[PDB]
Every structure is written in C-alpha cells, then in structure tokens.
Scaffold this active site. Structure first.
Site, PDB file in Angstrom:
ATOM      1  N   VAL A  84       0.676  -1.329   0.045  1.00  0.00           N
ATOM      2  CA  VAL A  84      -0.022  -0.067   0.049  1.00  0.00           C
ATOM      3  C   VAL A  84       0.630   1.188  -0.009  1.00  0.00           C
ATOM      4  CG1 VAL A  84      -1.891   1.093   0.937  1.00  0.00           C
ATOM      5  CG2 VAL A  84      -1.878  -1.370   1.355  1.00  0.00           C
ATOM      6  N   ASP A 114     -14.991  -7.953  13.084  1.00  0.00           N
ATOM      7  CA  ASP A 114     -13.500  -7.589  13.483  1.00  0.00           C
ATOM      8  C   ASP A 114     -13.286  -6.256  13.722  1.00  0.00           C
ATOM      9  OD1 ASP A 114     -10.781  -8.081  14.435  1.00  0.00           O
ATOM     10  OD2 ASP A 114     -10.245  -8.445  12.400  1.00  0.00           O
TER      11      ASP A 114
END
EC number: 2.7.12.2
Length: 296
Positions: A36, A145
């Site tokens: 990224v 999550d």
C-alpha cells in the site's frame, strides 16, 4: 456510477488517468512497502492511498482484497466508510486508489500515550455505528473484527471504517463472550451484537488509554477474563458523561440476548448528542499530531 477502471473520480470530478500519472511517495504506513503506497496524482495534486494487488500474489489474499473492494465500490453513499476513487489494471497488477487516512485509532492511541477525549470518541462512535449498520442493512455484512486498527481518522476530521476485512468472513482481545463460547449449542452463530461488544471494548481502551485486559500474559488468559469477570466499564472519576458511561455499559452487556443491536444504539442519547454537537475533530487531530511529532 463510478468509472471502476482507468479513471480517478475525486472531488466530484472524473479524471482519465493511468498508473504513470501517480508519483510514488512510499509505503503508506510503516512496513506497508511493496503493497500500500502513498501517491500523488500529478494532474490534480491529490495525495491518495494506492493498494497494489499483484497478479503473481497470494491467491487467498487477492480474493479478500477483491471481496473488500466489492463492498467498498457499492458503499459510495456511506459517509463513514473509506472510499475508492478508482482502479488501474495492468497485465501484472491491479492498483486500487483509496482515500488516504492519517492514522487508525490503534496508532493514534500509541502516539498519544494516553486517553482520547470523550468528544472525539462521540464523533467516532456515531461514525462507526453508522458504518457498521450500513454494512449490515445494505450489504448483509457482519463485520466480525471491530477494533481500533479498523477505525480511521484524518486531518480533515473525518472518521471512517477501514476497508480491510470490510466484507467480513490476538484481537481475541475484542471478542464477545458468546463468540468465545456460544451459549446455545444448537444455534451457535454470533451476530452483529458480537461487534457491538467489540465496539464497547474499543471505546473503553481509547477513553482510558488502557486496554481493559492489559495484565494478561497469554491470549487464552484474556478469553478467561472476558468470560469470568464483570464487563470492564468506564471509570467513574475521569469526568465521563452519564451518556457515555450508559452507552458503554449497554455495548458491554455480557448476555448478548440483552445487548442492543445497531438500531437501538442509534436511539441512544450519546449518539443523538454527537450527531448534532459540533466538535472540531480536524483541529484536535492536527494539534495532537503537532505535539507528538518526532523530527524527520
């Protein structure tokens, strides 16, 4: 509908674009190199996140990236979810251009080295509940999550849910009792209430600057505390509003049959307050980053 490849739509404007139009400013975060990137779109000066999915890459991982991207693309009308600006597809890679956030709540807590103010957490709570609700209501997605690393903030004062794992199915730390130990064998599946609990834990951790089960030396010990001990509530002597204490006590109801779903949380006075109360999150964020800046 957004041009899903060969374009970046940013601001409200669509720009023909390609990978050479972006200057690579390096890993977006520490050890995000190779995967990224923070990049500058030369045509406009915008600085964006670009996820690079290599065709030669790990297949399961690429399947998750693609599932998460599917959800992000169809979440264009949710203000509380990080946005995709576009993609570029080459013979060897897919580049997924995303809104660049400054930091997640986990890194913010680490950098702060202390409590995050209630006012900031009020705005956070509204954004994350509304994001989780949208996900479930529109896309049928149970996130599964919720934790500080998936809560993103920026210098514009925006607070959004991260794209990572946003399509749903250590951080056993944030696991609801019924998820650890389904109290009905014959109907074992946890639901969005397990994410509600995770939100509650996350809030207490951020409000205090202490993870509520910090003295645990093993992951299993943490699960034993979740089950055996009273829910870890906000302290009474840090000046927290009764609204905030209630909101958290509600999220941290051990009996998941009595724990509010998102619809109910969206009626809470804590949320009603922070929907309308003006909080300059942007100034706060810029101020605290400045106070904790290490020389280059």
């Amino acid at each position: 509908s957004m041009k899903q490849t060969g374009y970046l739509t940013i601001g409200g404007q669509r720009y023909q674009a390609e990978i050479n139009d972006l200057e690579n400013l390096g890993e977006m975060g520490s050890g995000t190199c190779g995967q990224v990137w923070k990049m500058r779109f030369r045509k406009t000066g915008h600085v964006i996140a670009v996820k690079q999915m290599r065709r030669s890459g790990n297949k399961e991982e690429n399947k998750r990236i693609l599932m998460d991207l599917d959800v992000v693309l169809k979440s264009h009308d949710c203000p509380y979810i990080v946005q995709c600006f576009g993609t570029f597809i080459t013979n060897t890679d897919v580049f997924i251009a995303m809104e660049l956030m400054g930091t997640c709540a986990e890194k913010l807590k680490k950098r702060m080295q202390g409590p995050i103010p209630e006012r900031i957490l009020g705005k956070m709570t509204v954004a994350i509940v509304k994001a989780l609700y949208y996900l479930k209501e529109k896309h049928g997605v149970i996130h599964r999550d919720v934790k500080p690393s998936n809560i993103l903030l920026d210098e514009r004062g925006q607070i959004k849910l991260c794209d990572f794992g946003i399509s749903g199915r250590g951080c056993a730390a944030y696991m609801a009792p019924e998820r650890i130990d389904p109290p009905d064998p014959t109907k074992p599946d946890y639901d969005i209430r397990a994410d509600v609990w995770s939100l509650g834990i996350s809030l207490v951790e951020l409000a205090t600057g202490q993870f509520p089960y910090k003295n645990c030396k093993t992951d299993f010990e943490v699960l034993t505390k979740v089950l055996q001990e009273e829910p870890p509530l906000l302290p009474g002597h840090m000046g927290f509003s009764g609204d905030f204490q209630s909101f958290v006590k509600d999220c941290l109801t051990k009996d998941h049959r009595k724990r509010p779903k998102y619809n109910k949380l969206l009626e809470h006075s804590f949320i009603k307050r922070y929907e309308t109360l003006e909080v300059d999150v942007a100034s706060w964020f810029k101020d605290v980053m400045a106070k904790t800046e290490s020389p280059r």
